[PDB]
Amino acid sequence: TRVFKKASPNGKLTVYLGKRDFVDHIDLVEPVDGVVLVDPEYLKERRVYVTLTCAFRYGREDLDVLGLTFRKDLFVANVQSFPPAPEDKKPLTRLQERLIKKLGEHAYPFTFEIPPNLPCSVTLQPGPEDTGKACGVDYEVKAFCAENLEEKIHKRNSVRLVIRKVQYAPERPGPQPTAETTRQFLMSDKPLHLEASLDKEIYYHGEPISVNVHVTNNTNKTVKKIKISVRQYADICLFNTAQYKCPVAMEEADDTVAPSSTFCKVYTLTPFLANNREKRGLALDGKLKHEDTNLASSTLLREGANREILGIIVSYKVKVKLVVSSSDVAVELPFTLMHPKDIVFEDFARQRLK
Numbered sequence: 001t002r003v004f005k006k007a008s009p010n011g012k013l014t015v016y017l018g019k020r021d022f023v024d025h026i027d028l029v030e031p032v033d034g035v036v037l038v039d040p041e042y043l044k045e046r047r048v049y050v051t052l053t054c055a056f057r058y059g060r061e062d063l064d065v066l067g068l069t070f071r072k073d074l075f076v077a078n079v080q081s082f083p084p085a086p087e088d089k090k091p092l093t094r095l096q097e098r099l100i101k102k103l104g105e106h107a108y109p110f111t112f113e114i115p116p117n118l119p120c121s122v123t124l125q126p127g128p129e130d131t132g133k134a135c136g137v138d139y140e141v142k143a144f145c146a147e148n149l150e151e152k153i154h155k156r157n158s159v160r161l162v163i164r165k166v167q168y169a170p171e172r173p174g175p176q177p178t179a180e181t182t183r184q185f186l187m188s189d190k191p192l193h194l195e196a197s198l199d200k201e202i203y204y205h206g207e208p209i210s211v212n213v214h215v216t217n218n219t220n221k222t223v224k225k226i227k228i229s230v231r232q233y234a235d236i237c238l239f240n241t242a243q244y245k246c247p248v249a250m251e252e253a254d255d256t257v258a259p260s261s262t263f264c265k266v267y268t269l270t271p272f273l274a275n276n277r278e279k280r281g282l283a284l285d286g287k288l289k290h291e292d293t294n295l296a297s298s299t300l301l302r303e304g305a306n307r308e309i310l311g312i313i314v315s316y317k318v319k320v321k322l323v324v325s326s327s328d329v330a331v332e333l334p335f336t337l338m339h340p341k342d343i344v345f346e347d348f349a350r351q352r353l354k
């Protein structure tokens, strides 16, 4: 197997994790299981704690910073760790029993169970014009040394790392998302009928989207060209609320539809951060520099669910538009963008770009 690890500035403490991206379904959220490597001597009476903070921050770009003008803690989990507290139990995973057996007796576990209805790692990077500042929800994991819970943590024998809560939806049976609209122009009842659909409801980053477009032109006019697009919507709903709208895929085609005839065709679009990096105003599931970052996924939410608490709500839509020679006639279908998915330690730091 493969495990990521990071040590405190003074290599006296070291965290070990088997993933840096935890996949949350709807039912459950993959458990966050790891272990710390301690120096019992180096710390007399001092202890080892590990906590999991989940918070929304606005201003600078990473929670652990001193330039953000707003912050709301959405979750906190503290754990007693070096001094094994019989109180604070666990069964123990098996990347653990394994790990502990390769690190020794100074190896200590910890486990976090992230509630299911918490927002997932989403980051929105405002661009050049946009008057808003950066913001996002991050999951900080920290293991530090101290006597009491309260003494003062020091950026030295302490370690922090951002993990990620990524959303996975399985794709059900259901009907393909459809949309249609009829249009009658001035001086005539002859209609121009538009109707589109997507091959499915759920897609994953990198996965192509097929759009079945059908056009029934009873009109005496002509459809010059057709434009297909995929747009993202990001609603920052906490400190300073605002709504960002941004196209992540377009595909205009000079397809013609003559008077009194029926048209038909299948278009293929691919929303991607790569062909959008540049762009800014959109929501991502991480930082840009970080390779391994995608477009923010669709914020799932429920009945009687608190929207503000989610931080940034993200959604996608496919828009079909006919330019009729005007008032183009158009429809839009909504879809859900989701996430896919001998030891030998490896750094934790996320791989970079170019």
Ligand SMILES: O=P(O)(O)O[C@H]1[C@H](OP(=O)(O)O)[C@@H](OP(=O)(O)O)[C@H](OP(=O)(O)O)[C@@H](OP(=O)(O)O)[C@H]1OP(=O)(O)O
Residues within 6 Å of the ligand: 227, 229, 245, 246, 247, 250, 321, 330
């Ligand atoms: O479909 P297009 O020919 O590409 O025009 C669209 C678009 O909508 P249209 O179908 O509606 O006229 C927007 O109008 P709405 O979708 O909001 O109704 C508009 O967005 P805003 O006017 O809300 O800003 C956006 O411009 P932008 O990307 O600056 O938001 C612009 O996009 P296109 O040139 O990029 O495709």
Ligand SMILES: [Mg+2]
Residues within 6 Å of the ligand: 169, 170, 171, 172
């Ligand atoms: Mg599926």
